């Protein structure tokens, strides 16, 4: 097979031994599925609690041959321009510490208990919101910390490549992009990147209530299948 395993509420020792230490991805069930965000966060709730706040928005075109420009707008404007009406471009309220900006929302989540297995402080855990329409796509990339990616709204297709396959992923030569792959995962140029086709991977569709553990430096690729809202915990 090649799917990420799903475990229900495993023990801290079981998670530590079989996944954190060796660096193996896993989906945790029955952990975040009773967080209040799982029943409260609708577009209506998000507009009520956050609608008038300014948020950074990444905007790019469906044509992949562009950069994402970074702008500012109110959550109300974001929802109106990029979620409800057919938009020319895709907009993504991505990698934002919304819960520091709006503590009222921090009541609706928690920090997974498994984070305490790390060697860092809880006051150093980065919490980011990923709120966007169907069709947002990350590059294939790796991050310098452990990650819990919690799906709240919608589904996301995720592809994972171990740091050991890095050679077949053709990272960019620039220093600023050495953590990012040059390959388009879902339509690769196998004439320019032939080693990509035989690089093994894990994949999953992450659904609401589920938590994907992305080991530090594990390459991950993310595409939103629906109107989606995710919360990531970056920790060490
Ligand atoms: C700011 O970055 C952008 C900008 C535009 C499009 C995609 C991305 C990155 N997309 C992710 C990266 N990393 C994670 C993770 O959990 O580490 C999650 C996502 C996710 O889109 O859900
Ligand atoms: Mn990432």
Author numbering: 181 to 416
Task: Reproduce, without paraphrasing, sentences from the article in which this PDB structure was first reported.
Jumonji-C domain-containing protein 5 (JMJD5) is a 2-oxoglutarate (2OG)-dependent oxygenase that plays important roles in development, circadian rhythm, and cancer through unclear mechanisms. We have shown that JMJD5 can catalyze the diastereospecific C3 hydroxylation of specific Arg-residues in synthetic peptides based on the sequences of human regulator of chromosome condensation domain-containing protein 1 (RCCD1; i.e., R141), with which it is reported to interact in cells, and the 40S ribosomal protein S6 (RPS6; i.e., R137) in vitro. Following the observation that the broad-spectrum 2OG oxygenase inhibitor pyridine-2,4-dicarboxylic acid (2,4-PDCA) is a 2OG-competing JMJD5 inhibitor, we report that 5-aminoalkyl-substituted 2,4-PDCA derivatives are potent JMJD5 inhibitors manifesting selectivity for JMJD5 over other human 2OG oxygenases. Crystallographic analyses with five inhibitors imply induced fit binding and reveal that the 2,4-PDCA C5 substituent orients into the JMJD5 substrate-binding pocket.
